[PDB]
Amino acid sequence: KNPKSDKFKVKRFHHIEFWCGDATNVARRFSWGLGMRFSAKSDLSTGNMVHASYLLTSGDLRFLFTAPYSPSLSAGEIKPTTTASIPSFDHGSCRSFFSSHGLGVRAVAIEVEDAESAFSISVANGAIPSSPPIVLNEAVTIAEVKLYGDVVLRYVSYKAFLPGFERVEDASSFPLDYGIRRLDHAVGNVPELGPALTYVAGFTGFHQFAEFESGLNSAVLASNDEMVLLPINEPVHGTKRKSQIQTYLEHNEGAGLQHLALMSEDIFRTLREMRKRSSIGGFDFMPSPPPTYYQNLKKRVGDVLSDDQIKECEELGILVDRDDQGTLLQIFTKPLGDRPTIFIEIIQRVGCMMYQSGGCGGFGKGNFSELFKSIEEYE
Amino acid sequence: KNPKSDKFKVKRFHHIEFWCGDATNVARRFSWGLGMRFSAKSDLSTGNMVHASYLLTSGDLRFLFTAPYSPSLSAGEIKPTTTASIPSFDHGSCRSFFSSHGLGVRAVAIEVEDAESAFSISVANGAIPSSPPIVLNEAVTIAEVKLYGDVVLRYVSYKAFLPGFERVEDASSFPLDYGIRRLDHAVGNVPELGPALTYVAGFTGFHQFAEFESGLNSAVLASNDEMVLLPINEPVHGTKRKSQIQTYLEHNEGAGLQHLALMSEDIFRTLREMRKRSSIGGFDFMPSPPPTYYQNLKKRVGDVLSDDQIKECEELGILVDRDDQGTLLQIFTKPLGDRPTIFIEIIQRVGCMMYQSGGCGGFGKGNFSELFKSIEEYE
Numbered sequence: 001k002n003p004k005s006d007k008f009k010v011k012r013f014h015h016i017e018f019w020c021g022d023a024t025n026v027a028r029r030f031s032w033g034l035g036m037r038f039s040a041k042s043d044l045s046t047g048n049m050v051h052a053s054y055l056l057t058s059g060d061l062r063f064l065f066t067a068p069y070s071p072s073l074s075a076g077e078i079k080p081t082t083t084a085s086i087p088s089f090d091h092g093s094c095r096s097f098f099s100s101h102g103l104g105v106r107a108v109a110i111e112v113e114d115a116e117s118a119f120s121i122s123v124a125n126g127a128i129p130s131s132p133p134i135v136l137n138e139a140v141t142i143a144e145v146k147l148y149g150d151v152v153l154r155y156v157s158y159k160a161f162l163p164g165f166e167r168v169e170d171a172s173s174f175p176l177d178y179g180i181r182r183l184d185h186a187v188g189n190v191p192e193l194g195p196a197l198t199y200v201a202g203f204t205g206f207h208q209f210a211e212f213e214s215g216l217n218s219a220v221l222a223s224n225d226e227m228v229l230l231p232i233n234e235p236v237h238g239t240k241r242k243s244q245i246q247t248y249l250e251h252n253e254g255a256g257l258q259h260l261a262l263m264s265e266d267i268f269r270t271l272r273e274m275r276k277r278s279s280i281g282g283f284d285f286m287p288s289p290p291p292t293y294y295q296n297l298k299k300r301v302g303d304v305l306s307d308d309q310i311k312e313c314e315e316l317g318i319l320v321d322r323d324d325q326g327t328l329l330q331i332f333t334k335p336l337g338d339r340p341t342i343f344i345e346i347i348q349r350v351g352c353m354m355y356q357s358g359g360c361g362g363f364g365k366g367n368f369s370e371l372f373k374s375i376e377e378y379e
Numbered sequence: 380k381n382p383k384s385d386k387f388k389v390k391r392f393h394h395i396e397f398w399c400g401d402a403t404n405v406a407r408r409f410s411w412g413l414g415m416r417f418s419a420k421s422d423l424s425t426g427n428m429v430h431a432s433y434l435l436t437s438g439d440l441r442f443l444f445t446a447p448y449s450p451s452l453s454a455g456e457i458k459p460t461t462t463a464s465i466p467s468f469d470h471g472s473c474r475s476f477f478s479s480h481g482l483g484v485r486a487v488a489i490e491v492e493d494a495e496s497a498f499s500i501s502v503a504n505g506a507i508p509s510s511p512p513i514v515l516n517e518a519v520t521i522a523e524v525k526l527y528g529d530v531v532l533r534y535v536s537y538k539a540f541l542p543g544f545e546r547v548e549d550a551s552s553f554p555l556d557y558g559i560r561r562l563d564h565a566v567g568n569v570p571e572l573g574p575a576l577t578y579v580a581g582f583t584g585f586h587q588f589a590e591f592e593s594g595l596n597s598a599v600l601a602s603n604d605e606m607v608l609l610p611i612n613e614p615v616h617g618t619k620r621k622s623q624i625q626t627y628l629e630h631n632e633g634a635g636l637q638h639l640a641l642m643s644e645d646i647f648r649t650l651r652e653m654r655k656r657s658s659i660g661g662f663d664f665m666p667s668p669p670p671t672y673y674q675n676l677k678k679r680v681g682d683v684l685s686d687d688q689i690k691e692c693e694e695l696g697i698l699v700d701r702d703d704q705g706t707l708l709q710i711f712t713k714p715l716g717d718r719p720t721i722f723i724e725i726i727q728r729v730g731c732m733m734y735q736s737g738g739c740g741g742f743g744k745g746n747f748s749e750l751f752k753s754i755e756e757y758e
């Protein structure tokens with residue numbers, strides 16, 4: 001059931017912005033670890049005396065890394081005279097965010113038809129405003145509302161990256177590519193799922209995406225065509241094993257973005273390339289499941305994957321899940337930074353062809369029981 | 380002239396500690412860019428609820444990257460019950476340092492015979508105490524005094540990395556090596572050279588190392604055997620071209636560490652390997668000099684380098700200087716992070732064999748005039 005109740009026209013995920021203490025080192029690490037090319041910049045070299053911002057791209061995926069300069073460089077400026085390319089940026093907000101949460105996502109940005117309208121309708125329907133609509137060089141409009149914790153939902157609309165950003169020099173722009181193509185979903189952890197859902201569904205009109213002792217309850221909000229997917233988790237307390245959602249909330253100092261799921265056009269190539277670089281500056285992956293997991297895969301997905309595709313999952317630690325319509329290949333990195341908070345998921349979806357429908361195969365919640373089962377019986 | 384006036388016994392540079400907002404991403408970037416192996420850690424996985432600290436090593440060079448966790452993780456602790464492995468660490472000091480200066484060196488650490496004695500003698504001779512001597516697991520003693528800005532000189536002495544640090548798992552520890560072997564010198568930028576020299580020479584007994592419109596005045600303080608080398612720069616104002624020391628002070632919010640010089644056993648291999656990785660997560664280098672610079676090299680160092688070693692300098696952008704005793708090969712990276720502040724120098728010294736004497740060939744200040752000259756005549 002999809003009531004298509006969006007209160008304004010939503011297109012696709014546009015970008016994800018990390019707030020950093022040093023954008024250069026985070027961006028360079030991410031570029032090498034994920035195979036994303038340096039595509040645009042806004043910084044001292046482009047006249048921006050406020051913040052350093054670097055954009056990485058892989059296919060349609062856009063990762064933005066931003067950090068503040070010394071406020072003294074821009075102390076003479078006022079908002080009408082700002083050299084910032086992202087007018088919502090605030091030194092104090094950025095420093096407070098990173099000292100509170102460490103490295104993490106500040107903005108989940110979606111492209112809309114009309115960012116001023118999206119902002120107005122959102123706030124009229126309960127959204128907490130974060131930054132009012134601002135038109136950039138008469139070409140792009142950006143507005144922000146609170147999503148959860150200190151994460152904002154950013155609306156971007158284009159009349160025709162952002163004004164004031166410059167393209168990166170070819171010598172400075174090495175064409176890395178490990179097969180990642182777009183953001184599939186972005187997941188938040190909150191203390192209470194009910195109020196978080198009521199709030200976000202309330203101001204967007206996003207609807208609950210149909211699903212099918214893991215320490216969580218979750219639900220997924222989705223746009224009309226179910227290409228913007230925003231799952232939200234809450235912890236389940238009292239368990240023997242402590243909820244990883246509760247661990248997140250403690251180390252993050254509250255609610256925030258838990259993981260980003262990046263769609264690959266070839267998850268096997270992506271995982272070969274990322275795993276090659278794990279120990280030389282890239283990303284680590286969670287501990288692989290025991291062989292019983294892959295032994296149990298023939299009974300579960302033998303009609304979708306060959307034996308030569310299943311043992312290849314075993315080689316790379318890929319997980320597999322399935323719903324009524326499609327099949328999901330997924331794997332999770334270790335946390336992206338110092339704290340056990342944000343991580344990345346790599347995903348490939350098989351099925352639901354009409355183009356592929358959104359969320360084809362679900363989000364892998366069956367892998368919770370399947371992993372525990374495989375572990376126990378592996379003993 | 381070397382009066383050998385050290386007020387306490389100094390051995391060698393021991394490590395350099397960067398204060399970061401996220402130690403993981405900085406350490407992984409540096410490891411790949413410089414060919415340094417992950418060697419030890421102190422973090423949540425080792426029981427440290429205070430700070431995340433990661434050690435990179437290449438030969439005798441030790442780079443430590445530290446960032447604070449949420450204070451809430453350790454709010455029940457007191458200094459007698461701390462889980463920090465570096466007892467001088469303070470959340471507030473670290474967050475203040477990184478918000479003020481961005482990514483940079485907090486501690487220049489030298490190994491001494493007796494860190495408690497070094498601290499006491501230093502403070503008795505005018506050193507401003509930063510952290511009193513503390514004995515770690517009855518095995519290592521660490522103490523800190525102010526050096527310049529918010530940079531400390533850290534004394535480390537061993538009765539026999541640090542207690543509480545654990546060695547990094549072999550699978551997590553990839554044996555990168557581009558030929559870097561030790562720290563040659565560490566350079567500070569200050570507003571006024573005179574008072575900075577009087578202070579540091581005053582409490583160490585370090586002596587002025589003999590030298591031979593660049594925007595700076597500088598002097599070098601050295602230990603008895605001239606293996607601990609601490610150059611200090613001040614800006615020269617009024618010039619046509621603005622002093623890079625003044626630019627540093629403005630963007631750094633005052634005095635701090637300007638550059639680290641890393642000795643390579645083979646600067647050609649090091650620069651080939653680093654330059655290969657510049658655009659894939661590593662470090663960039665300053666713009667190469669014009670061909671007139673390398674055309675002028677035969678007249679200056681033709682008795683030390685072959686033609687096949689000189690054009691190889693041209694290929695890699697290596698600079699060359701010479702004093703009365705030895706020859707210096709050097710090159711400079713672009714700034715290591717967002718701000719135009721700290722950078723790295725790669726160095727190889729030729730000559731002064733007895734082992735090699737310290738500072739053999741000087742610090743390359745002739746390359747200031749030689750670079751400008753080559754540029755002008757290249758036109």
Ligand SMILES: Cc1ccccc1Cn1nnc2ccc(C(=O)[C@H]3C(=O)CCC[C@@H]3O)c(C)c2c1=O
Nearest residue numbers: 187214218231233244332345363364365367368371
């Ligand atoms: C780390 C850990 C700790 C305890 C037990 C298991 C594991 C490892 N693990 N197993 N199965 C998973 C299945 C799905 C997902 C998602 O993507 C989610 C999503 O997208 C929306 C719905 C909520 C999800 O959780 C994730 C993270 C995992 C997972 O992390």
Ligand SMILES: Cc1ccccc1Cn1nnc2ccc(C(=O)[C@H]3C(=O)CCC[C@@H]3O)c(C)c2c1=O
Nearest residue numbers: 566593597610612623711724742743744746747750
């Ligand atoms: C970036 C810039 C801007 C203006 C003009 C020239 C350049 C490039 N440049 N040329 N020659 C150099 C020669 C030596 C050194 C050192 O190592 C120092 C040292 O170790 C102690 C003594 C003080 C030094 O400066 C350095 C950084 C450079 C250098 O940076």
Ligand SMILES: [Co+2]
Nearest residue numbers: 187261345363
């Ligand atoms: Co997911």
Ligand SMILES: [Co+2]
Nearest residue numbers: 566640724742
């Ligand atoms: Co130098």
